[PDB]
Enzyme design. Sequence first.
Site, PDB file in Angstrom:
ATOM      1  CG  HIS A 172      16.264  14.159  19.334  1.00 16.02           C
ATOM      2  ND1 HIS A 172      16.460  12.707  19.444  1.00 16.02           N
ATOM      3  CD2 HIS A 172      15.403  14.510  18.448  1.00 16.02           C
ATOM      4  CE1 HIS A 172      15.862  12.209  18.548  1.00 16.02           C
ATOM      5  NE2 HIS A 172      15.159  13.431  17.853  1.00 16.02           N
ATOM      6  CG  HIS A 228      19.396  22.747  21.462  1.00 19.06           C
ATOM      7  ND1 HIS A 228      19.439  23.538  20.260  1.00 19.06           N
ATOM      8  CD2 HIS A 228      20.381  21.909  21.408  1.00 19.06           C
ATOM      9  CE1 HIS A 228      20.503  23.062  19.436  1.00 19.06           C
ATOM     10  NE2 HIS A 228      21.108  22.028  20.189  1.00 19.06           N
ATOM     11  CG  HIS A 280      23.851  19.149  23.012  1.00 24.81           C
ATOM     12  ND1 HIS A 280      23.374  18.154  22.259  1.00 24.81           N
ATOM     13  CD2 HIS A 280      23.892  20.342  22.516  1.00 24.81           C
ATOM     14  CE1 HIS A 280      22.888  18.712  21.276  1.00 24.81           C
ATOM     15  NE2 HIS A 280      23.325  19.963  21.151  1.00 24.81           N
ATOM     16  CD  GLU A 332      26.510  18.153  20.896  1.00 23.67           C
ATOM     17  OE1 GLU A 332      26.073  19.063  20.122  1.00 23.67           O
ATOM     18  OE2 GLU A 332      26.243  16.861  20.786  1.00 23.67           O
ATOM     19  CG  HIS A 356      24.492  23.808  20.788  1.00 17.37           C
ATOM     20  ND1 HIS A 356      24.198  22.701  20.176  1.00 17.37           N
ATOM     21  CD2 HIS A 356      25.946  24.217  21.245  1.00 17.37           C
ATOM     22  CE1 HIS A 356      25.696  22.274  20.529  1.00 17.37           C
ATOM     23  NE2 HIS A 356      26.576  23.008  20.887  1.00 17.37           N
ATOM     24  CB  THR A 396      25.887  18.334  17.162  1.00  9.63           C
ATOM     25  OG1 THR A 396      24.873  18.751  17.877  1.00  9.63           O
ATOM     26  CG2 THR A 396      26.978  19.235  16.973  1.00  9.63           C
TER      27      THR A 396
HETATM   28  C1  LIG Z   1      20.054  23.857  12.854  1.00 12.36           C
HETATM   29  C2  LIG Z   1      20.213  22.818  13.842  1.00 12.36           C
HETATM   30  C3  LIG Z   1      19.439  21.627  14.001  1.00 12.36           C
HETATM   31  C4  LIG Z   1      19.697  20.550  14.720  1.00 12.36           C
HETATM   32  C5  LIG Z   1      18.900  19.357  14.737  1.00 12.36           C
HETATM   33  C6  LIG Z   1      20.569  20.553  15.520  1.00 12.36           C
HETATM   34  C7  LIG Z   1      21.616  21.905  15.761  1.00 12.36           C
HETATM   35  C8  LIG Z   1      21.266  22.889  14.878  1.00 12.36           C
HETATM   36  S1  LIG Z   1      22.959  22.105  16.713  1.00 12.36           S
HETATM   37  O1  LIG Z   1      22.821  23.403  17.430  1.00 12.36           O
HETATM   38  O2  LIG Z   1      24.088  21.638  15.958  1.00 12.36           O
HETATM   39  N1  LIG Z   1      22.784  20.898  17.750  1.00 12.36           N
HETATM   40  C9  LIG Z   1      22.077  19.628  17.686  1.00 12.36           C
HETATM   41  O3  LIG Z   1      21.944  18.985  18.364  1.00 12.36           O
HETATM   42  N2  LIG Z   1      20.971  19.796  16.590  1.00 12.36           N
HETATM   43 ZN   LIG Z   2      22.797  21.242  19.843  1.00 10.79          ZN
END
Ligand SMILES: Cc1cc(C)c2c(c1)S(=O)(=O)NC(=O)N2
Ligand SMILES: [Zn+2]
Length: 257
Positions: A61, A91, A93, A103, A116, A195
Amino acid sequence: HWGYGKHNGPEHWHKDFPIAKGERQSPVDIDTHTAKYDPSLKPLSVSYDQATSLRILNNGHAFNVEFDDSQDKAVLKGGPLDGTYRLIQFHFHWGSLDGQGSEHTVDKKKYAAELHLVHWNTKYGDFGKAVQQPDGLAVLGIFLKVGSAKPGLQKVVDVLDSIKTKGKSADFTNFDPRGLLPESLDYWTYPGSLTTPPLLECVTWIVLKEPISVSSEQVLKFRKLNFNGEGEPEELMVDNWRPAQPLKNRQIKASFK
Ligand SMILES: Cc1cc(C)c2c(c1)S(=O)(=O)NC(=O)N2
Ligand SMILES: [Zn+2]
Ligand SMILES: Cc1cc(C)c2c(c1)S(=O)(=O)NC(=O)N2
Protein backbone atom coordinates in the site's frame (compact mmCIF):
# COMPACT_ATOMS: atom_id res chain seq x y z
CA HIS A 1 -8.94 -7.38 -0.39
CA TRP A 2 -8.79 -3.60 -0.17
CA GLY A 3 -6.69 -1.32 -2.30
CA TYR A 4 -6.85 1.73 -4.50
CA GLY A 5 -8.21 0.21 -7.70
CA LYS A 6 -11.64 0.76 -9.17
CA HIS A 7 -13.01 -2.50 -7.78
CA ASN A 8 -11.40 -2.35 -4.31
CA GLY A 9 -10.70 1.34 -3.68
CA PRO A 10 -12.02 3.89 -1.19
CA GLU A 11 -15.66 3.72 -2.37
CA HIS A 12 -15.70 -0.01 -1.55
CA TRP A 13 -13.99 -0.01 1.87
CA HIS A 14 -17.21 0.50 3.85
CA LYS A 15 -18.45 -2.99 2.98
CA ASP A 16 -15.71 -4.66 5.03
CA PHE A 17 -15.04 -1.66 7.31
CA PRO A 18 -18.36 0.08 8.07
CA ILE A 19 -16.52 2.70 10.14
CA ALA A 20 -15.55 4.14 6.73
CA LYS A 21 -18.82 6.11 7.01
CA GLY A 22 -18.15 7.08 10.62
CA GLU A 23 -18.20 10.36 12.48
CA ARG A 24 -14.44 11.09 12.57
CA GLN A 25 -12.93 9.80 9.34
CA SER A 26 -9.76 11.08 7.70
CA PRO A 27 -8.47 12.76 5.66
CA VAL A 28 -10.43 16.01 5.45
CA ASP A 29 -10.25 19.25 3.59
CA ILE A 30 -8.73 21.95 5.77
CA ASP A 31 -10.72 25.10 5.11
CA THR A 32 -8.23 27.68 6.30
CA HIS A 33 -10.82 30.41 6.76
CA THR A 34 -13.04 28.18 8.97
CA ALA A 35 -10.29 26.71 11.18
CA LYS A 36 -10.11 28.57 14.47
CA TYR A 37 -6.90 29.87 15.97
CA ASP A 38 -6.67 28.38 19.45
CA PRO A 39 -4.25 30.39 21.64
CA SER A 40 -4.32 27.61 24.26
CA LEU A 41 -2.52 25.22 21.90
CA LYS A 42 1.12 24.81 22.78
CA PRO A 43 4.05 24.62 20.37
CA LEU A 44 4.73 21.14 19.12
CA SER A 45 7.68 19.34 20.66
CA VAL A 46 9.27 17.02 18.08
CA SER A 47 12.21 15.23 19.74
CA TYR A 48 13.82 12.98 17.11
CA ASP A 49 17.54 13.32 18.01
CA GLN A 50 17.67 9.75 19.40
CA ALA A 51 15.46 8.08 16.77
CA THR A 52 16.52 4.55 15.84
CA SER A 53 15.34 3.50 12.39
CA LEU A 54 15.40 -0.23 11.62
CA ARG A 55 13.88 -1.24 8.32
CA ILE A 56 11.99 -0.13 5.25
CA LEU A 57 9.09 -2.29 4.02
CA ASN A 58 6.86 -2.29 0.92
CA ASN A 59 3.57 -3.45 2.45
CA GLY A 60 1.61 -3.37 -0.81
CA HIS A 61 0.00 0.00 0.00
CA ALA A 62 3.00 2.28 0.66
CA PHE A 63 6.58 1.99 1.90
CA ASN A 64 7.02 2.19 5.68
CA VAL A 65 10.22 3.21 7.48
CA GLU A 66 10.00 1.49 10.87
CA PHE A 67 11.63 2.56 14.12
CA ASP A 68 12.58 0.92 17.40
CA ASP A 69 9.77 2.00 19.73
CA SER A 70 10.74 -0.16 22.76
CA GLN A 71 11.98 2.96 24.60
CA ASP A 72 11.23 6.72 24.53
CA LYS A 73 13.78 7.54 21.83
CA ALA A 74 11.83 9.64 19.31
CA VAL A 75 8.75 11.32 20.74
CA LEU A 76 6.09 13.87 19.91
CA LYS A 77 4.60 15.95 22.73
CA GLY A 78 2.93 19.28 23.25
CA GLY A 79 0.61 20.88 20.77
CA PRO A 80 -2.88 19.46 21.35
CA LEU A 81 -1.47 16.31 22.95
CA ASP A 82 -1.66 15.15 26.54
CA GLY A 83 1.31 12.96 27.36
CA THR A 84 4.03 11.43 25.23
CA TYR A 85 3.65 9.74 21.86
CA ARG A 86 6.40 7.48 20.51
CA LEU A 87 7.42 7.36 16.85
CA ILE A 88 6.82 3.90 15.36
CA GLN A 89 6.97 4.44 11.58
CA PHE A 90 6.57 6.87 8.73
CA HIS A 91 5.26 6.47 5.20
CA PHE A 92 3.96 8.55 2.30
CA HIS A 93 0.93 8.82 0.03
CA TRP A 94 1.51 10.14 -3.49
CA GLY A 95 0.02 10.63 -6.94
CA SER A 96 0.54 9.47 -10.49
CA LEU A 97 1.00 13.16 -11.39
CA ASP A 98 2.42 16.12 -9.47
CA GLY A 99 -1.05 17.73 -9.30
CA GLN A 100 -2.42 15.13 -6.84
CA GLY A 101 -1.31 12.71 -4.16
CA SER A 102 -1.98 14.21 -0.76
CA GLU A 103 -4.77 12.93 1.46
CA HIS A 104 -5.49 16.13 3.33
CA THR A 105 -6.20 19.16 1.19
CA VAL A 106 -5.89 22.84 2.00
CA ASP A 107 -8.76 24.92 0.64
CA LYS A 108 -9.23 22.01 -1.81
CA LYS A 109 -5.57 22.11 -2.93
CA LYS A 110 -4.05 18.65 -3.43
CA TYR A 111 -0.29 18.44 -2.95
CA ALA A 112 1.98 15.99 -4.78
CA ALA A 113 2.37 13.78 -1.72
CA GLU A 114 1.90 13.61 2.04
CA LEU A 115 4.21 12.25 4.74
CA HIS A 116 2.68 10.56 7.81
CA LEU A 117 4.87 10.24 10.92
CA VAL A 118 2.96 7.81 13.13
CA HIS A 119 3.23 7.94 16.94
CA TRP A 120 1.43 6.05 19.72
CA ASN A 121 0.40 7.22 23.18
CA THR A 122 2.75 5.61 25.70
CA LYS A 123 0.06 5.45 28.38
CA TYR A 124 -1.38 2.42 26.55
CA GLY A 125 1.92 0.50 26.65
CA ASP A 126 2.14 -0.57 23.03
CA PHE A 127 0.86 0.24 19.58
CA GLY A 128 -1.72 -2.55 19.49
CA LYS A 129 -3.43 -1.28 22.64
CA ALA A 130 -3.13 2.35 21.55
CA VAL A 131 -5.03 1.89 18.28
CA GLN A 132 -8.05 0.77 20.34
CA GLN A 133 -8.34 4.17 22.03
CA PRO A 134 -9.73 7.50 20.79
CA ASP A 135 -6.49 9.25 21.81
CA GLY A 136 -4.20 6.36 20.93
CA LEU A 137 -2.24 7.82 18.01
CA ALA A 138 -0.86 11.14 16.88
CA VAL A 139 0.00 11.39 13.20
CA LEU A 140 2.13 14.30 12.03
CA GLY A 141 1.19 15.04 8.44
CA ILE A 142 3.52 16.99 6.17
CA PHE A 143 2.71 18.04 2.61
CA LEU A 144 5.18 17.60 -0.25
CA LYS A 145 5.33 19.90 -3.26
CA VAL A 146 7.55 19.47 -6.29
CA GLY A 147 10.39 21.96 -6.56
CA SER A 148 13.89 21.74 -5.15
CA ALA A 149 15.15 18.41 -3.87
CA LYS A 150 14.87 17.52 -0.19
CA PRO A 151 18.39 16.35 0.76
CA GLY A 152 17.16 14.42 3.79
CA LEU A 153 14.82 12.36 1.64
CA GLN A 154 17.46 11.07 -0.76
CA LYS A 155 18.55 8.11 1.39
CA VAL A 156 14.94 6.90 1.27
CA VAL A 157 14.71 7.38 -2.50
CA ASP A 158 17.91 5.46 -3.12
CA VAL A 159 16.79 2.29 -1.31
CA LEU A 160 13.42 1.99 -3.08
CA ASP A 161 14.87 -0.15 -5.89
CA SER A 162 15.51 -2.83 -3.25
CA ILE A 163 11.86 -2.98 -2.09
CA LYS A 164 10.11 -2.69 -5.43
CA THR A 165 7.37 -5.22 -4.72
CA LYS A 166 4.94 -6.08 -1.96
CA GLY A 167 6.49 -7.91 0.99
CA LYS A 168 10.06 -6.85 0.34
CA SER A 169 12.04 -5.18 3.10
CA ALA A 170 15.55 -3.85 3.56
CA ASP A 171 17.70 -2.82 6.46
CA PHE A 172 17.37 0.91 7.00
CA THR A 173 19.35 1.94 10.05
CA ASN A 174 20.68 5.36 11.07
CA PHE A 175 18.07 7.36 9.15
CA ASP A 176 17.36 10.76 10.74
CA PRO A 177 13.73 11.86 10.23
CA ARG A 178 14.61 15.42 11.24
CA GLY A 179 15.70 15.87 7.64
CA LEU A 180 12.07 15.51 6.51
CA LEU A 181 10.70 18.45 8.55
CA PRO A 182 9.99 21.97 7.27
CA GLU A 183 11.29 25.04 9.09
CA SER A 184 8.01 25.97 10.78
CA LEU A 185 5.99 23.73 13.09
CA ASP A 186 2.77 25.77 12.71
CA TYR A 187 -0.09 23.29 12.38
CA TRP A 188 -3.76 22.49 12.15
CA THR A 189 -5.23 19.76 14.36
CA TYR A 190 -8.45 17.75 14.47
CA PRO A 191 -9.64 14.32 15.66
CA GLY A 192 -9.77 11.65 12.97
CA SER A 193 -8.88 8.18 11.84
CA LEU A 194 -6.43 5.98 9.98
CA THR A 195 -6.73 6.75 6.27
CA THR A 196 -6.67 3.07 5.19
CA PRO A 197 -8.45 0.01 6.55
CA PRO A 198 -9.06 -0.71 9.36
CA LEU A 199 -9.93 3.03 9.42
CA LEU A 200 -9.91 3.12 13.23
CA GLU A 201 -10.97 6.39 14.84
CA CYS A 202 -7.94 6.68 17.09
CA VAL A 203 -5.89 9.58 15.64
CA THR A 204 -5.16 13.13 16.73
CA TRP A 205 -4.11 14.61 13.39
CA ILE A 206 -1.47 17.32 13.40
CA VAL A 207 -0.98 18.70 9.88
CA LEU A 208 1.87 21.15 9.28
CA LYS A 209 1.06 24.31 7.35
CA GLU A 210 4.46 24.52 5.65
CA PRO A 211 5.08 21.91 2.92
CA ILE A 212 8.47 20.47 2.20
CA SER A 213 9.85 20.67 -1.33
CA VAL A 214 11.03 17.51 -3.11
CA SER A 215 12.36 17.22 -6.64
CA SER A 216 10.51 15.80 -9.62
CA GLU A 217 13.14 13.03 -9.75
CA GLN A 218 12.55 12.12 -6.09
CA VAL A 219 8.78 11.72 -6.47
CA LEU A 220 9.23 9.98 -9.84
CA LYS A 221 11.13 7.27 -7.97
CA PHE A 222 8.22 6.78 -5.54
CA ARG A 223 6.09 6.06 -8.61
CA LYS A 224 8.32 3.17 -9.72
CA LEU A 225 7.31 1.05 -6.74
CA ASN A 226 4.76 -1.73 -7.25
CA PHE A 227 1.54 -2.61 -5.42
CA ASN A 228 1.96 -6.23 -6.55
CA GLY A 229 4.33 -8.87 -5.32
CA GLU A 230 7.25 -10.27 -7.26
CA GLY A 231 6.17 -12.57 -10.07
CA GLU A 232 2.75 -10.91 -10.34
CA PRO A 233 1.59 -8.49 -13.05
CA GLU A 234 3.11 -5.07 -12.52
CA GLU A 235 0.80 -2.43 -11.06
CA LEU A 236 2.59 0.82 -10.29
CA MET A 237 2.20 2.10 -6.73
CA VAL A 238 0.64 5.49 -7.50
CA ASP A 239 -2.47 7.32 -6.28
CA ASN A 240 -2.38 5.53 -2.91
CA TRP A 241 -4.43 8.29 -1.29
CA ARG A 242 -7.95 8.43 0.16
CA PRO A 243 -9.97 11.53 -0.80
CA ALA A 244 -11.32 14.02 1.71
CA GLN A 245 -14.13 12.73 3.93
CA PRO A 246 -17.02 14.63 5.54
CA LEU A 247 -15.98 16.82 8.48
CA LYS A 248 -19.27 16.16 10.27
CA ASN A 249 -19.33 17.44 13.85
CA ARG A 250 -15.67 18.41 14.07
CA GLN A 251 -13.66 21.59 14.43
CA ILE A 252 -10.19 22.09 12.98
CA LYS A 253 -7.99 24.27 15.18
CA ALA A 254 -4.96 26.29 14.07
CA SER A 255 -1.86 26.86 16.17
CA PHE A 256 -1.15 30.13 14.38
CA LYS A 257 -2.77 33.40 13.40
C1 LIG B 1 -1.60 3.47 12.75
C2 LIG B 1 -1.81 3.65 11.25
C3 LIG B 1 -2.06 2.51 10.54
C4 LIG B 1 -2.33 2.63 9.21
C5 LIG B 1 -2.58 1.39 8.36
C6 LIG B 1 -2.28 3.90 8.64
C7 LIG B 1 -2.05 5.08 9.30
C8 LIG B 1 -1.77 4.94 10.67
S1 LIG B 1 -2.16 6.57 8.60
O1 LIG B 1 -1.08 7.44 9.06
O2 LIG B 1 -3.49 7.10 8.86
N1 LIG B 1 -2.15 6.44 7.02
C9 LIG B 1 -2.46 5.19 6.38
O3 LIG B 1 -2.56 5.06 5.25
N2 LIG B 1 -2.55 3.88 7.13
ZN1 LIG C 1 -0.80 7.42 5.85
C1 LIG D 1 -5.07 4.44 30.42
C2 LIG D 1 -5.70 3.13 29.97
C3 LIG D 1 -7.08 3.00 29.99
C4 LIG D 1 -7.65 1.82 29.55
C5 LIG D 1 -9.16 1.60 29.58
C6 LIG D 1 -6.81 0.78 29.09
C7 LIG D 1 -5.44 0.89 29.05
C8 LIG D 1 -4.88 2.09 29.50
S1 LIG D 1 -4.48 -0.30 28.42
O1 LIG D 1 -3.27 -0.41 29.25
O2 LIG D 1 -4.16 0.12 27.05
N1 LIG D 1 -5.23 -1.68 28.13
C9 LIG D 1 -6.69 -1.74 28.16
O3 LIG D 1 -7.27 -2.73 27.84
N2 LIG D 1 -7.52 -0.54 28.64
